[PDB]
Amino acid sequence: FYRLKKIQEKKKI
Amino acid sequence: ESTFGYVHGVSGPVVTACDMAGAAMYELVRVGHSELVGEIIRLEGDMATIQVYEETSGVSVGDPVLRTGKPLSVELGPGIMGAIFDGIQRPLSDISSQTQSIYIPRGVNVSALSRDIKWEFIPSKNLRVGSHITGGDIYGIVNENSLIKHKIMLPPRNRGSVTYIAPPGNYDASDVVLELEFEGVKEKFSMVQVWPVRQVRPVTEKLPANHPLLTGQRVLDALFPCVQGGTTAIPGAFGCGKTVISQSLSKYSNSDVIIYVGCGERGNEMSEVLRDFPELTMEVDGKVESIMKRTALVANTSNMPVAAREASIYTGITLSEYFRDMGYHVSMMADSTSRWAEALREISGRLAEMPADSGYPAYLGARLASFYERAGRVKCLGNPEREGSVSIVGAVSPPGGDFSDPVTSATLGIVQVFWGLDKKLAQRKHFPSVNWLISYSKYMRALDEYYDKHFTEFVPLRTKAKEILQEEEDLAEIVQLVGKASLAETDKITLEVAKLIKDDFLQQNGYTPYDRFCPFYKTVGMLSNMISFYDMARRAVETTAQSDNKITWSIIREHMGEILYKLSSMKFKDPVKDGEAKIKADYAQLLEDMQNAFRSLE
Amino acid sequence: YLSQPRLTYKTVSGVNGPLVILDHVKFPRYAEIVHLTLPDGTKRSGQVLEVSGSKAVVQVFEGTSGIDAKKTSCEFTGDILRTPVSEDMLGRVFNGSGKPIDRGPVVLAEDFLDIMGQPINPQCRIYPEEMIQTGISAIDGMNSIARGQKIPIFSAAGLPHNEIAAQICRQAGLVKKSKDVVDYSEENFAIVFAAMGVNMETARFFKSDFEENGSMDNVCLFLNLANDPTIERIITPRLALTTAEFLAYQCEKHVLVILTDMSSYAEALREVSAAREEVPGRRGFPGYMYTDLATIYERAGRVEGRNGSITQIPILTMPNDDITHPIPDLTGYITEGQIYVDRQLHNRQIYPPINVLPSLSRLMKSAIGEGMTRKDHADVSNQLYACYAIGKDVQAMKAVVGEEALTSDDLLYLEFLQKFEKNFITQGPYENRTVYETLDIGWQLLRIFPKEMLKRIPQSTLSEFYPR
Amino acid sequence: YLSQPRLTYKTVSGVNGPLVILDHVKFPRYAEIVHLTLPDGTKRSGQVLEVSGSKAVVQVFEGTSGIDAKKTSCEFTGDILRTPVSEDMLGRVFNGSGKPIDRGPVVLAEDFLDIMGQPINPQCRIYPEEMIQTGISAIDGMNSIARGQKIPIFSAAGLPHNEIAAQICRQAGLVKKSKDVVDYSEENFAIVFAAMGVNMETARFFKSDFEENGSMDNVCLFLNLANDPTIERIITPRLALTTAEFLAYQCEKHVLVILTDMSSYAEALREVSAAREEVPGRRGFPGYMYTDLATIYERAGRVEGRNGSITQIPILTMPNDDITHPIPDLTGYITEGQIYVDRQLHNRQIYPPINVLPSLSRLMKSAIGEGMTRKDHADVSNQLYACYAIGKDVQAMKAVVGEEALTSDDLLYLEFLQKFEKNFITQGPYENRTVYETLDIGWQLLRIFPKEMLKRIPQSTLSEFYPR
Amino acid sequence: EKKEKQIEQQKKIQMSNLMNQARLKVLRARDDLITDLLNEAKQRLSKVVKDTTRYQVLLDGLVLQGLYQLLEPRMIVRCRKQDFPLVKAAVQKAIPMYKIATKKDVDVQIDQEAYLPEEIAGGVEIYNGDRKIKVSNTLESRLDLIAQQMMPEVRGALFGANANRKFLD
C-alpha cells in the first residue's frame, strides 16, 4: 500500500 | 491524415511515437526498418504508446512508423486445417520451408494461408444471377481433405444480389470466386475472410445444452458430466493427465474439430505434442486416417514475447467460433491461462496502470469472462438452417495449489463445471487424480431428461454412488482417532463397498487396452452392478439382524468370494479385444451369479 | 423544464484505458450523461467521472476501442441519469441498462425519477408488524421474515442457491387467509428480481422458469449477463431499487426485492475504483464499500401513513467459505439476521440444503403472533431446534459410545433427526408448502415423544395440541 | 556493416545510484554499449536502458564512483552487445564481463554473435529421448535426468549443493554401454560453468576439482566473485549460454550447462529495477521476472538435422526454506521440476541429502523402457515412490498417536523407511553406481514386503523378477 | 401421478405463453399508436413552417439562443440555401443585443458554400472558429427533445390517470 502511494505521489510531478 | 510517424522513445517493449494524430485505439502499425507489427494501446494529444510484438533491441529514435487502418485480425480460409500457428497466426511450417533455416528471422512477412495452391470449388447450385442473399449464406463447398469439407460462406453484415458464379473447377485465393452487386455499388470477393479477433461473430439464437459429451475418463463423466457445448476448467500446477484427456477426447467423441491452443508451454512439451499427435490415427469408416485432418494447433512457447501470449488465446477462440459458425461441433482446449493472466499483469504494470490485488489489474475478471462466455450451442445465421456448438475446457495453474489466488477465484466464479484435482490423490497414483469432493457441475438436471429417455437407470444408481462414496469419506473422517475399533457391521459394509468403488471403478490405466476409454453404457453397467451388490448385502444383513442369526461380513466374504472377485475383474472386460455383446452378457451373468450366491447364503 | 439545445464536441486530448479525456467544454457538471458516436457509426453511452475547469473525463460504458482523435462526436445531455419508472413495467424483461430485450416496446414512461434515490427519514420509519411466506417450509417455520426485514442468504460457489432463489420467487406471498379467503382475495403483492453478474446458462434458466410459473403478471425482471459492460453491473441495482420504491410508495403495494450475487457487485465496484486511480483500501476493496452497500441496503422498511412495504433478500457467495471475508462481514453488520446453506447438507443430496443450526433471525419474536398466525408457533420452533440439536450431538455421541449402550429415548432422538431431515427440510422444487402445513408437519414430528420430554412447550398448549 | 566513426559526449545531466543520464544525443539506439573515460584515466562500460527524445540513460557495469559532472566522456558504439566466440574458448577462465583472468591473451573472434539470442522456430525442435547416466541413484532410477532436459536443483544455505554439482559434472556419461566399447567411448561432454555471486572458496574449490579430474581441456568458466560489481550479474549467464549455443549448433558437440546461485541473479534484477523506479511486483521483484527467466531457461534442446544438444542443470538457494517463495515458484513453473536437496536429511548427516518425494522429472516417463534402459524400470520407481509416501504418512500418524493403535504393518513400513534412507539415498563422495545395479537395489528394497500388497506393479513383472 | 403432473404442467406452460403474447400485442399496438402521433406532429410542424411572418421571429429566437450557447470569439452559421435572406436579417438583428447583453464583441459569419440537407424541415446549426464545437438546433432535434421530456404528460392525457396512483410524490 505505502509503496504504491509513493509511486502515486511521484507521478504528480 | 499523415502516413508516416517517428519513434520518439523506447523503454522495454513499450515505445512512444510522435507525429500521428489521425490514428485511433487498437489499430496496427509497422515499426522500424524491420517492420515489426505493433498496436496502439493509449493516446494523448499527438503522441501515442505502441506495444511491439517482436523483440525491440536496436530500434533507434527517429525510425518511421507506417500506420494501417485495420485492427488485429485473423485470416480464415482453406488450408487452415492441419497446420501449426503462432500467436499472430503465422505459419511456422511455411517459414521453415521458405528460409530453410532454423530460426525466426525478425519481421518475417508471409501470408497466413497459401496463395499458390488450387482447391476444387463446387458452388451451391441453387443461386442464379439476380438472386438476393444476406450474410452467413453458404454458397459453395471445398474438399479440405478426406474427412472435412470446408464450407464457404459470405461474411456477416454483407448482402446484395448475384452477378457471376465461377463454374466448378480449380481456383485459388488470389482470383475472384464470387461477384455481388449491392443496391448502388458493386464489390467482389474471394475464398479468404479476415475478421477482427476481439469481436464476437453474430448468431441467430442460443440454445440449451441437450446432449452429453463423450470421454474416456469415467471420473467426471458419470460423476460430474460435461455437456456438448459446455464449459469447464482443468486446474493443476501442470497438465496432470490433461494431455491424455485431449488425446482421448479426440480419439473418442462426436466432435468434428479439435483446436488445442498452447500458451506459455515448455519447449520439450510442445515438441512432444507435435511429434506424437500427428502420428496418432483413427478409423472413421474402417480406414485409418490421421487426426491432423480434424485438428488445428496454435503453439506459443514461453520465450515468446508478452503481446503474443495475449493474442494467442483470442485468435484460437476466433478460429473455434468460425468453425462453429460453419455448422459443426467443436471442442477447444486452452492451456495455462494463469501465465496468460500473469503476462497481462506485466503489460499492465509497464503502462503504469494502478494494480489492485497481488498486482493483477482489476479488469482481469471482465476479460476472463469475455473469453469463456463465447462458448455454447447455437442456431446459425444463413439459409441452410444448420446447427453447431463449441465446448471449451480451460486450464488453471494455481500458485500453491489452492483457491487463494484471484485468478482461480475469478475463473471458479464463472465456469459452469469445476474439475478440481487432488494433490494427495496425485501422490497416491490412483490416476486420474480427481478430488470428487471440492468439484461440481451444473449439468445434472438437464442430462436427467436425456438419461431417462435412453437408459431409465442411470440417475438413481449415480446418486447412490455419490452417497456411498461420501459416507465412506465421513466414516474415514471419524475413524481416524479410534483406530477403526468402532467399525460396526453396517459401517463395515459401507466402508468396503465404497473402497471397492474407489479401487475398481474410480481409476483407470491409460496405457492399457481395457482402460483407455469407457463408453456411457459400460459405466452404467458397472455402476448398476455396484449398487446391486450393495443393495443385496444391506438387505440380507438387515433381514437377518431383525429376525435371527445375524449375517456379518465374515460369512459374506466366505460364501461369495467368487462373486466379489468377478466383480473386481469386470474392470478387465477388454472392449478392444471383445465385442459389446460379450461384455454386456458378462455383466448380466455376473449379476445373476451374485443373485444366485446371495440366494444360497440366504 | 429543460429547453436548451445540447452541445457536442470533436475534441479529444487523449484516451487511456476505459476513460476518454477531452477539454474546452462549457460549464460541465459532475455525473452528466454523455453520448458518443464513432467513425464506424456505432452509438455508445457513458458518464462523466472527472471535471476540472474546461477539462472533462468520461468513462465510456460500452468499453473503449477504436476511438479516433479527430473523428469522434461527443454529445452532452446536461442531466444526471433518470429512470422512466412506470407501474406497467410488470411482465417485462430488461437488460442492465434498462433497454427491453423481450421483443417488446420502449417503456411509455409514467414518471421520471432520480436513479440514486433519496435517504428516508428515520422519523417516518415504521416497525414491522407481520410475517410473510416464501413457499419454503424450512425458512418460514424456523426463521420468520417480517415486512421490512433485511435478511441475506450466505452461500458459496458450487451450491444450488440459484434454484432456491427461483423457488422463493415463484412462491412468495402473504398469509392473510387465516380468517377467510374472501378477504384474502385483495392481493397487492409483487416481486422485483435483479439478476446480476450471472452467466448465460443461469440467465436462460431464470427466464424460462419465471415464464413457466405462470405468475409473470406481477414480476419485474432485470438481467445483466457477465458479458455486458462491467459498469452496468453497478447501475442495475439502482434501477431495481428505484422501481421498487416507486411501486411501494406510489402504488401502496407490498414489494419483495431479491438481489443476486453481490460478490459480483463488489468486484465491479472494485474495478471502477481501480480505474478511477483511487488509493486501495482493505484487501484491495475500496474503503467506502461500507457506505455504498449501506445506501443500497437502507432503501427499505415501512413508511408511516403509507400502506406498503419493501423487503430485501440479498444473496452472496463467500470466497473459500470464509466467514470473515469482508463482503459477508459488512453485509452482516448492515443487515439484520442471516441464513446459511451448508456444503455437507447439499452433499447429502438434500434439497434445499438449508442448515438451520447456525441460521438466526432478528425480528422473529415480533413478526409472528396471535392473530397474524396461530398461537402455537414460537414454542414449536424452540422445541424443533432443541430436539434437533439434541439429536445431532447425540448421533455424535453414539458414534463412539456404541449403539448398544443407547437408551430407547436415544433411539427416539435419532428417529427425530432422520424424520426431520427426511420430511421437514426436504420439500422438492414445486411442493408449495404453506405456513399452516409447515406447523402441521412440525407437530407431527413432535408427536414421537411424550409431552414430558417436550419441556419447551407450555402445558396450556400441550392440553390442546399435543394429543392430536 | 557500419563504417562510420563513433560519437563522443561530455554532457552529463546527472547520475543517480548506478545510473547516468545524458543530454543532446543524436538518434540514440536502444541497448547499445558505451564506454566511460573517467578523469583519473581508467575506462568502464555500460548499456543503454531507456531513451526519450534527446535524453538517454545508461547503467554502469563496474559501479559508479568518482564520476565528475564535467570532465567525464561517454563514447557510443552504435551496436548492441556482439560478443566474440570461438572453439578456442575451452580451457580458459573469464571474469563476469568476459575479460580473461588466467593471464591469457584477449579473445580472438572466430565469429560475432548477438548476445540476446535469436529464438528457434519451435517447429524444428526434436523431442529428446536419450538418457544421461550420473551415478546418483537418487536421481537416476527415481527422477532420472535425460539429455536435453532442464532440471534445477533447489537447496539452501548450509547445504553442500556445490559439492554435489562438482560430483555431477565428474561422472557424466550415457547408459548405452552394452554395445561395443568403441560405440560408447566416443561420447564426451563439453562443460560450461558460470558462477554468479560466490565467495572465493567456492571458486577455488571448483577450479581445483576441475584440475584434479584432468578434464580442464573440455571446461570453460565464468567466475563472478561476491566482491565484484553487482550489475554485471545480469549479463554473465547470457555470455555462457551464447557460447553454449555456439558449441551446440556450430561445433556439433554435446554440452552440459551449470548455472549457480540464481538467487543472486534475481537480486541483481531487483536492484536494477528499483534503481529505475519502475512499477514493481510481488516481494519487490519486477513483475517481468517470468519473462526474463523464460528467456534464460528456454535456451535448451535439440534440433532436426543436427547432432549436438544442450542439457541445462541450474541450482539455486531457498530463502528460509520456503517453497512458495517467488523465485523457486517461477523456476518450477518454467523448468521441468525439482531435486530438492532437503535440509532435514542433511541434519542427519545424509549425503546427498535429497528428498525423493518432491523431486519431479517430466521427461523421465518416456526416457525409459525396453532397449533405452530396460523393460524393468518404471514400476520399480512408481512403487518405491508410493511406499515412501505411505511410510511418511505412517510416521506422521505415529507422531499423532503412537504404537498403541498401530499394527505390524506400520513397523514394517518404518523399517522400510529406515533401510531406504540407509541403502538407497546415501552414496558417498565418490560412490559411482550403475543403473542396472540401481534397479537391483530398488528390488532388494521392494522385497521387504510381500508381492501381494503391492498394487502399482502388475503381476507380470513380479512373475519374472520378484522371487529370489 | 407422474403422468398427470406432466400433462398439467405442460398445459400451464402453454396457457402462460399465450397470456404473455397477448399482453405484448397490446403494448405493441400502443407503441405504434404513439409513434404515429409523433409522425403527425412532425407533419404539422413541417406545414406550419411555410408562414414566413412568424418564421422570421422563430429563426431570430433560435439564432439568439445558439449565440448565447456557444459564446466564442469566432462563429459560423449554416442554413438551407433558400433561407439565406431571412437568416441574414436575423443575425443583423441578433448581433447588437447579444453584444450589449454580454459586454463583448464577436465576429459572426455565414458560409456560402456548405448548406444543410434539403430534407431537413428547417432551422440552423452553429459552429465555433475551428469548427470543432457545434450546437445543432433544428426543428427535428427540438421536437425530439420536447417529446421525450413530455412523454409522461402525453400518456396522462391520451390514456387517463393511473388507476392505483395514490400520491404524486
The ranges assigned to domains in chain D are: 1-468
Set of chain C residues whose Cβ sits within 8 Å of the Cβ of B468? none
The Cα of E13 is separated from the nearest Cα of chain C by a number of Å equal to 5
Residue D238 to residue C187: CA distance in whole angstroms: 80
Residue D133 to residue B332: CA distance in whole angstroms: 40
E71 → chain C, closest CA residue? C26
Which grid cell sits at C174? 402473504
Which grid cell sits at B188? 467482389
Contact B203, B380 (CB under 8 A): yes
Reduced to 3 states (helix: H, G, I; strand: E, B; else coil), residue B346 is helix
Which grid cell sits at E62? 433560435
Burial B219-229 (b: 16+ CB within 10 A, else e): bbbbbbbbbbb
Reduced to 3 states (helix: H, G, I; strand: E, B; else coil), residue B405 is coil
Interface membership of E19 toward C (CB under 8 Å)? yes
Interface membership of C65 toward B (CB under 8 Å)? yes
Mutation target among B42, B442, B445 for the C interface, most CBs of C within 10 A: B442
Contact B165, B142 (CB under 8 A): no
Q: How crowded is residue B37: how many other Cβ atoms within 10 Å of its Cβ?
A: 19
Residue B233 to residue B336: CA distance in whole angstroms: 11
* Burial of D222 per CB tally in 10 Å (0-12, 13-18, 19+): buried
Cα dihedral D262, D264, D268, D274 in deg (nearest 10): 110
Which grid cell sits at D184? 560408447
Set of chain A residues whose Cβ sits within 8 Å of the Cβ of B355? 4
Alpha helices in B484-579 (DSSP H): 489-505, 520-547, 553-559, 561-569
In degrees rounded to 5, what are phi and psi of residue E142?
-65, -40
The answer to whether C5 contacts E34, with C-beta atoms less than 8 Å apart, is no
Residue C189 to residue C255: CA distance in whole angstroms: 6
Which grid cell sits at B583? 461384455
Give the experimental resolution in Å: 4.4
Which grid cell sits at C222? 432485470
The three-state DSSP-derived secondary structure of chain C is CCCCCCCEECCCCEEECCEEEECCCCCCCCCCEEEEECCCCCEEEEEEEEEECCEEEEEECCCCCCCCCCCCEEEECCCCCEEEECHHHCCCEECCCCCECCCCCCCCCCEEEECCCCCCCHHHECCCCCECECCCHHHHHHCCCECCCECCEEECCCCCHHHHHHHHHHHCECCHHHCCCCCCCCCCEEEEEEEEEECHHHHHHHHHHHHHCCCHHHEEEEEEECCCCHHHHCCHHHHHHHHHHHHHHHHCCEEEEEECCHHHHHHHHHHHHHHCCCCCCHHHCCCCHHHHHHHHHCCCEEECCCCCEEEEEEEEECHHHCCCCHHHHHHHHHCCCCECECHHHHHCCCCCCECCCCCCCCCHHHHCCECCECCCCHHHHHHHHHHHHHHHHHHHHHHHHCCCCCCHHHHHHHHHHHHHHHHHCCCCCCCCCCHHHHHHHHHHHHCCCCCCCCCCCCHHHHHHHCCC
Which grid cell sits at D181? 566399447
Touching partners of A (3+ C-beta pairs < 8 Å): B, C, D
Which grid cell sits at C349? 443430496
Annotated binding site of B: 236-243
Strands C14-16 and B138-143: unpaired
The Cα of A9 is separated from the nearest Cα of chain C by a number of Å equal to 11
C26 → chain E, closest CA residue? E70
The answer to whether C13 contacts B362, with C-beta atoms less than 8 Å apart, is no
Residue B349 to residue B359: CA distance in whole angstroms: 8
In degrees rounded to 5, what are phi and psi of residue B233?
-155, 135
Stretch 295-324 of chain D: residues touching chain B, C-beta under 8 Å: 295, 297-298, 300-301, 303, 324
Contact B189, B178 (CB under 8 A): yes
* Burial of D82 per CB tally in 10 Å (0-12, 13-18, 19+): middle
Name the nearest CA neighbour of C69 among B1, D223, B341. Answer: B1
Q: How far is CA E70 from CA C4, C24, E78, in A?
A: 12, 11, 14
Identify the H or E element spanning B17: strand B14-18
Name the nearest CA neighbour of B212 among B459, B11, B4. Answer: B459
The answer to whether B397 contacts D336, with C-beta atoms less than 8 Å apart, is no
Length of chain B: 602
D294 → chain B, closest CA residue? B303
Contact E79, E112 (CB under 8 A): no
| Identity of the amino acid at B31 | V
Which grid cell sits at D28? 540514440
Query: Which residues, 6+ apart, have CB-to-CB distance to B72 below 8 Å?
Result: B26, B28, B39, B88, B196, B197, B198, B311
Identify the H or E element spanning B270: helix B267-276
Mutation target among B102, B397, B433, B500 for the D interface, most CBs of D within 10 A: B102
Which grid cell sits at E152? 409522461
Residue B164 to residue B161: CA distance in whole angstroms: 10
Interface membership of B33 toward D (CB under 8 Å)? no
Residue C104 to residue B270: CA distance in whole angstroms: 52
Q: How many CA atoms lie within 13 A of C280 on its CB side?
A: 21
Name the nearest CA neighbour of B214 among B519, B598, B487. Answer: B519
Identify the H or E element spanning D441: helix D435-446
Q: The domain C1-468: what is its CATH number?
A: 3.40.50.12240
Q: How crowded is residue C202: how many other Cβ atoms within 10 Å of its Cβ?
A: 21
State the residue for C-alpha cell 451374485: B594
DSSP state of D101: -
Contact B414, C226 (CB under 8 A): yes
Interface membership of A4 toward C (CB under 8 Å)? yes
∠ CA B412-B413-B414, nearest 5°, is 95
DSSP state of B200: P
Interface membership of D370 toward A (CB under 8 Å)? no
Residue D188 to residue B425: CA distance in whole angstroms: 41
Residue B535 to residue B531: CA distance in whole angstroms: 6
Contact E16, C214 (CB under 8 A): yes
Q: How many helices (H) and strands (E) does chain B have?
A: 15, 28
Query: How big is the A-B interface in CB pairs under 8 Å?
Result: 4
Length of chain C: 468
* Burial of B172 per CB tally in 10 Å (0-12, 13-18, 19+): middle
Residue B271 to residue B278: CA distance in whole angstroms: 12
Residue D128 to residue D323: CA distance in whole angstroms: 29
Which grid cell sits at B589? 451373468
In degrees rounded to 5, what are phi and psi of residue B137?
-80, 130
Name the nearest CA neighbour of D385 among D168, D154, D138, D150. Answer: D138
Q: How many CA atoms lie within 13 A of C256 on its CB side?
A: 23
DSSP state of D120: B
Stretch 240-269 of chain C: residues touching chain B, C-beta under 8 Å: 263-264, 267
State the residue for C-alpha cell 493403535: D405
Task: Report, in this order, helix, strand and coil percent for chain D, each rounded to 5.
Answer: 35, 20, 45
Interface membership of A3 toward B (CB under 8 Å)? no
B508 → chain D, closest CA residue? D456
What separation, in Å, do the N-terminal and C-terminal C-alpha atoms of chain C show? 69
| Identity of the amino acid at E41 | A
Contact B259, B253 (CB under 8 A): no
Q: How far is CA D24 from CA B8, B10, B118, D27, in A?
A: 14, 16, 57, 9
Cα dihedral B564, B566, B568, B570 in deg (nearest 10): -150
Q: How far is CA E60 from CA C58, D130, D134, D311, in A?
A: 34, 93, 98, 87
Q: How crowded is residue D163: how many other Cβ atoms within 10 Å of its Cβ?
A: 16
Set of chain E residues whose Cβ sits within 8 Å of the Cβ of C216? 16, 20
Strands C254-259 and C309-317: parallel
Q: How many CA atoms lie within 13 A of B142 on its CB side?
A: 25
Contact E67, E75 (CB under 8 A): yes
Sign, CA dihedral D279-D280-D286-D290, equals negative
Reduced to 3 states (helix: H, G, I; strand: E, B; else coil), residue D354 is strand
Contact D77, D32 (CB under 8 A): yes
Length of chain E: 169
Query: Which residues, 6+ apart, have CB-to-CB distance to D418 below 8 Å?
Result: none
Stretch 268-287 of chain D: residues touching chain A, C-beta under 8 Å: 277, 279-280
Contact B379, B327 (CB under 8 A): no
Q: Which long-range contacts (CB under 8 A, 24 or more apart) does B383-386 make?
A: B383/B133, B383/B137, B383/B138, B384/B137, B384/B138, B384/B327, B386/B138, B386/B327
Which grid cell sits at C135? 413457499
Name the nearest CA neighbour of C136 among C158, C160, C112, C157. Answer: C160
∠ CA C270-C276-C281, nearest 5°, is 50
Residue C94 region, left (φ>0) first, then alpha (ψ -120 to 50), else beta? Answer: beta
Mutation target among D283, D333, D383 for the B interface, most CBs of B within 10 A: D333
Name the nearest CA neighbour of B190 among B77, B69, B315, B112. Answer: B77
Q: How far is CA B373 from CA B390, B393, C270, in A?
A: 11, 12, 21
Which grid cell sits at C239? 434501477
Residues after which a C–N gap over 2.5 Å breaks chain A: none
Q: Do chains D and E touch (3 or more CB pairs under 8 A)?
A: no
The answer to whether C280 contacts A1, with C-beta atoms less than 8 Å apart, is yes
Sheet containing E74-78: order of strands: C74-75, C8-9, E133-138, E123-128, E74-78, E107-110
State the residue for C-alpha cell 464476437: B200
Which grid cell sits at D18? 548506478
Peptide bond just before D84 cis, omega within 30 deg: no
Q: How crowded is residue D322: how many other Cβ atoms within 10 Å of its Cβ?
A: 12
Which grid cell sits at B353? 496502470
| Identity of the amino acid at B41 | I
Strands (E), D217-322: 219-222, 255-260, 302-303, 310-312, 315-317
Reduced to 3 states (helix: H, G, I; strand: E, B; else coil), residue E128 is strand
Peptide bond just before D352 cis, omega within 30 deg: yes
Mutation target among C276, C278, C279 for the A interface, most CBs of A within 10 A: C279
The answer to whether D277 contacts A3, with C-beta atoms less than 8 Å apart, is no
State the residue for C-alpha cell 404453506: C434
Q: Cα-atom radius of gyration of chain B, to the nearest Å?
A: 29
Query: Which residues, 6+ apart, have CB-to-CB distance to C102 below 8 Å?
Result: C92, C93, E24
State the residue for C-alpha cell 476501442: C65
Query: Which residues, 6+ apart, have CB-to-CB distance to E158 below 8 Å?
Result: E34, E37
Q: Which residues pair with B11 in a beta bridge?
A: B13, D50
∠ CA B52-B314-B197, nearest 5°, is 80
State the residue for C-alpha cell 470464509: C322
Cα dihedral D355, D359, D365, D370 in deg (nearest 10): -30
Set of chain D residues whose Cβ sits within 8 Å of the Cβ of B59? 29-30
Reduced to 3 states (helix: H, G, I; strand: E, B; else coil), residue B85 is strand
Q: Cα-atom radius of gyration of chain C, to the nearest Å?
A: 26
| Identity of the amino acid at D77 | T
